Assembly symmetry: C7
Homo-oligomer: 287 residues x 7
């Protein structure tokens, strides 16, 4: 409040301005060595206790009068405590710098004791900066079923420090944002043309009808509705040939499945594929 | 105590103020080079031994008189020891800075010997800052069964440096707070619409009745009471088809289960599902 | 706007230039100690509130007039908020430096409170610099199916901070660029002469016809069309001899396969190889 | 010793004070440029060799006279060697700073050569600070069977740098304290209401009597003495249904077991549970 | 261009040199406080806009005239953008330092905002320095089939930041050079006297003929051509004795195999070894 | 040698002291700007080439005269090379600081080029400081069979940088000391009351005699000589009940076994336990 | 060359010394503000282009005249390029410091742009310092078959940055030296009294003859020649008792085996042990 707090803050620096310092030129060691360390030494000592009144009138204005603020009560009552040590740290650290008493000895205990809280606020401040860069980069939105670190889930909320995303067990995970600027984000809702990589083991003991099984499965997959063909072709090749079988890794490429249309297709592709395998008189394998 | 400690602290700087320095202008090298290094050199040397009396009268006022303080006795008796080296470090480090003796040689052994304890207090101070950010971000409360790093447990206490949460074995884990600003917090009590991902292997050898099993299991799951349907549909599709079977991954989505209502449902969904499988004359699979 | 914002910015420094400071030589402590801390103290205090008008007229010029800018609306409305704390930080940090009030006490809270955001912007700024080095080094292009960390996918987009590459499940992964300057990038589209490393177990119980199987498989592989021979020779040697079998690790080297020509060859090489094995009357092994 | 060491330390600075410097005002370059670099250059050079006598009279006073000190002999004989390089480093680093010879060139080899031992003492000093924070935070006491990193053991000793805790093999592990401020501490002796999570596979082939087995096991567990019921209910639900069986995950919640009362209960709960399973005519499963 | 760009760069500092500053000694605050902050303040302000013309005439000289330079077009068009912010950063950061306006407030936003890009360019600059040390240390050449981190491949190219090496699947891996100064490089082409470590399980049930099998296999291996014997002897000892067998770990040491001469030997050593095992009437084991 | 090296070192600074500088007051720019940059500029330039003679007379005094020193020859011949670049670095870095030529430009290439070797000597200097803290903390002695990181072995030697401990294969491991201040040290020779955690599977199919087996095994273990009972009781409970068996985890607590008395007890406890199991007519299990 | 390069380097500073600066006292702003910024500004500007001639006459003296130097040609031709940017960096960084133009703005772009290459040369310079500490600590020699990180091999070469050691596959691994000051070095050639830890499963079904098997195996092992007994006794105890067997972990301690004497003993100890087992009529186990 710039209309009601400057009275003991600024009127008591107009006081020490006029009463003792400016009007009075008393020659008993008060000009050469006290005119500068008691104006700047007293502007600061009554600008720190300006900011203490501008700060602790967020006690009167925000929590006492308004209904606990735009924060909560326990959030703002420890904010009028962690901003009262960062105001005493700048208060003693600037009031000792202007009074000339121990200038570069309190600045080195408060520039090193204040870089201790910069070595240590690399996690919470890294989350603030990475969550500040998620607003520019935009990897996801409020519905995208992303995954950072096997943290598959749809994004509930996007905060500054932590985005909360609702897990595969429908548990609201609260991912810190520094896991988004240092890790892979597999965004799974801005995804068109999804894919199948299934595998069917099959007991042949023939090893020569199997290019016709591998041809007719491809002829199933490219003559399938809701299958995308502009990207990679539907592949069905064999691998892992053993004493009795050869497992065919069926691959296909769907188009914009909605997760209940998806599993009907991942079911019916594999079932129709097994129908084509049983058409050639060969049963399925033991793995 | 600003009413009873300034006597040998501040009366002996009013002493060296008036007796030797201010009133006396003795010309034998006492003004050009001793007026400033013995006022600021003696304000500081009797402000450090002010803070030593304000500090060691927390011995008389807190532990000797009051019942061992708001800390314990062994907490505050090593606090009147770790604050007596941070007062001798600022005492020699400011008393050597005002006396001009070795200014930037003690400041570089105490600004580097004091950043050794800032390289090293990145764990305990990181826990203080991350536990100070848990008050603003609020990932959990005193009942939330969260997990940070396979550290599943309900939160007993929320401290500055370590929140203690009671484990799955009902052992009170004491998680440091820097595991909350750098890691995922799967908060499991602000969770509505929980889910089932079960799997049922089933020996068919038919592979063509199985869309009717996969349809009738879905018709069980969406006609089930206490099952949420506004989010993802109850899915029952097959995967991993082999020589004799196909395992059906039954998925469902419950609503706000209370962990004893939960397992009755995760039991009866799977039992009723097996009843529907045995209705179609197919038994369960070998995995 | 250098034609319409300097009026209250620069005309009110020509004001305090001429009106009070330059023309007026009033001897009541206004020259020795106020001529420099109120010109540079007021150039800066009306150059910060120049840049506040040049900055908040990107509100009028970019989002209000033009259609939300070359950024979006929510991108530029938090850019006129994160550039208004970096202008108040340089505003108080330079306005306190020119006014001489607490010079090296606000510079040490803003050079340490501004290196807190340099300890912490090592992820987002590391992504900017590594994505700035991807433009010079060029590991990949817009079609290259690269992989950084089991992150196999063709590159959709190449941004500053994150390149997005479409995964093996055709999910648009959004890889941060610092995973490209610190990790291996297996670029799989600037690849000629691809290879096969297959394995065929085979029940012999002879262990002496097997150099003729290993010779005739090599004679298959080097007399194969679309097989590259200028690099490593097509090898077929045995390993892992056991109670009944010896698995032959067939290796070959193809030439510039197009991923649907590829698996036809990886099929027919192994099938023709099994035809050569069954020509020598030995069946395949149990692994 | 402030009564017997100042003789060659301080009497030879009263010597160079009176004999050559203070009383003598010889005009051959001895006042303008030698009065300050040979008082502060000789106070320091006879305050370093004060601290060398106060330091090496811990040789006479502590190890030679007293029985090897409160440390050992090999501890204090290398402490009068690592404090004689930190006194020669501050001795040359302050004696070169007061003599003006190479001020900011020895301070930059001793403020950088002394931050080499601050980059490197982040492990031992991190253990000192984290073990100094274990006195305030108090995660455990001298009997608590804690575990930090699969380091299960009861705490023998709690030092500054390393707490030693006696392992599960009854080997005295010596955990560094920085593993307590950066890692989870599962304190297992301030634990009330311990739990059972057992599993019983059981060959049913019925799948319809099993809600009565799951009801009667719960009726065993809540009608059990020394079982806590104010927290989570005793659950017995099925999971992992397969070709012949369904494994029932029996859970229960005991009360303050003393590790030999515990395993009698974890035995008799599972035995009585198997008695209830064999009461319903179904045998146990194959897993 | 030092023959055609200094005209508006340097002729307009000879202008402000002669016209206003040097020849003119106008006494209206232009000598005591403007002679130094407007020569060095205007040398710099017309040396930055010298380097802007020397820089943006790499636009005219390199890309517009010559065919897109020794870089590409998109490489050099973002190089005339990332060198125009490092010239505006040094331009405002030196032009504000010479004009005296906010000296140590812009230097602390540009020495800390420029060490943000030194905390962050530790990956790309680490690759430049480690790839600059690969030229001195020389771990490999353009044909060496090295491996850093299971990154087996022959080295295609050796760049500054990334050496590209063609993988075991003949995919051109692009390894960053900091994986060569911090990790093991198994250089496999400057390798003489390669080795075999094979294993043969063998069903004996005798356990007493086996020193003669282990002697005759060694007599095979040292009487083998292309086998090196100056280093370690060819060993054949048993290990892992079980119910029926004992697996003999045959070791040998070849000489400078060329990868197709190699596998013929690794085949024929094991085949001849099995011939010696079948000579003693014992068949091979089950593992 | 302070009796024979100061002749060209210190006599040539008494030379430039008296001959040119002190006695001669020649007014041709030799007092205002050359009296200080050529005394301190020549004290240093003949104190660096004092330390070069005090350093390279460790060539004459230590290796040439004495038998290669208390180090070896190859140790001290590279110590008169790595101390001749740290003397040229302080020689040019202080000789350029006193001569005033480029003071803060060589100090910033030698305070940053000398903190490059402080970023990098965090491993070797961390080993020196952690091995300097092993002398105070004392985790082990010269016979203690400790383990740091699955590095089980008895400690042969305890150096400054690396303690060498003889492995479980009796290979002298050379552990760096920074693995002792950052990792767990399971000291296994200051261990009293060792333990057994054995397991016996046993085919019962009774599940009701097994509290008498679990009682009689405990009655064996507490009536056993050389078994400690003041700590945890000898436990024998069952776990992992399956189709036919229940494995009993026998635990016991021995007393100060000497590793050949140990395994006789770990043998005879399990054998006597199996005798008690076969007394109750039940054989051992399949696991 | 201090006899032929100082002509344009030093004769053109004797030129600007005598011709314009020293002899000429022209009063047109050439003494107060140009006498110091153009002597030190021109000593440096003709000492940098002294070192450019002393540097680029390693082009004439080393590679052009001598046969490509003690380095190679490609090593020294990029050394006359990476020392020509560290001479232009110190050239502009000191020439801008003496000319006074932008002193603390180029020093902060070259003390921060030169600590970017100190954040980044922590790998190559860490290898130089750790390989410089391998000369003092001496963990190994040129024949020692050491292992750092499963990097078993005999040491071929010991460089500054990387020691190359020939692998178990006889591939010359090139280990960086920072893997020796931060990791365990199991030096396996300064090893006396090697050991055996073998295991023999054995089908007993007796469980009472087995102390006589465990006694007679020990009587074999201590009555064995080339077996060391001054350290740990030869142990043979049982563990892992199951349905039919008990595996006896035979341990022994050999003496200074030479790797072909070794495996004959590790063979014959196990064979003789199996002979003693078959003497007691019990066959070997199934594991």
């Amino acid at each position: 409040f710039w209309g009601a707090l400057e009275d003991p803050a600024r009127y008591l620096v107009t006081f020490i301005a006029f009463a003792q310092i400016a009007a009075m030129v008393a020659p008993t060691t008060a000009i050469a060595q006290y005119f500068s360390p008691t104006v700047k030494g007293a502007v600061i000592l009554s600008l720190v206790w300006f900011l203490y009144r501008w700060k602790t009138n967020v006690i009167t204005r925000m929590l006492s009068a308004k209904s606990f603020g735009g924060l909560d009560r326990e959030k703002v009552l420890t904010l009028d405590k962690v901003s009262s040590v960062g105001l005493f740290a700048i208060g003693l650290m600037a009031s000792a710098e202007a009074c000339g008493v121990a200038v570069q000895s309190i600045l080195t205990v408060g520039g090193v004791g204040g870089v201790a809280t910069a070595f240590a606020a690399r996690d919470i401040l890294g989350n603030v900066l990475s969550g500040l860069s998620m607003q520019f980069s935009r990897p996801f939105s409020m519905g995208d079923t992303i995954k950072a670190g096997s943290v598959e889930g749809q994004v509930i909320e996007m905060g500054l420090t932590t985005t909360s995303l609702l897990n595969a067990e429908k548990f609201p995970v609260l991912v810190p944002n520094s896991l988004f600027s240092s890790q892979v984000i597999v965004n799974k809702s801005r995804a068109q043309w999804r894919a199948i990589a299934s595998k069917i083991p099959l007991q042949i003991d023939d090893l020569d009808m199997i290019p016709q099984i591998s041809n007719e499965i491809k002829e199933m997959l490219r003559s399938n509705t809701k299958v995308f063909l502009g990207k990679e072709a539907p592949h069905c090749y064999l691998s892992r040939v053993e004493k009795s079988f050869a497992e065919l890794t069926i691959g296909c490429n769907l188009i914009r499945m909605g997760k209940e249309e998806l599993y009907n297709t991942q079911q019916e592709v594999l079932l129709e594929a097994v129908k084509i395998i049983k058409k050639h008189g060969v049963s399925l394998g033991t793995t």
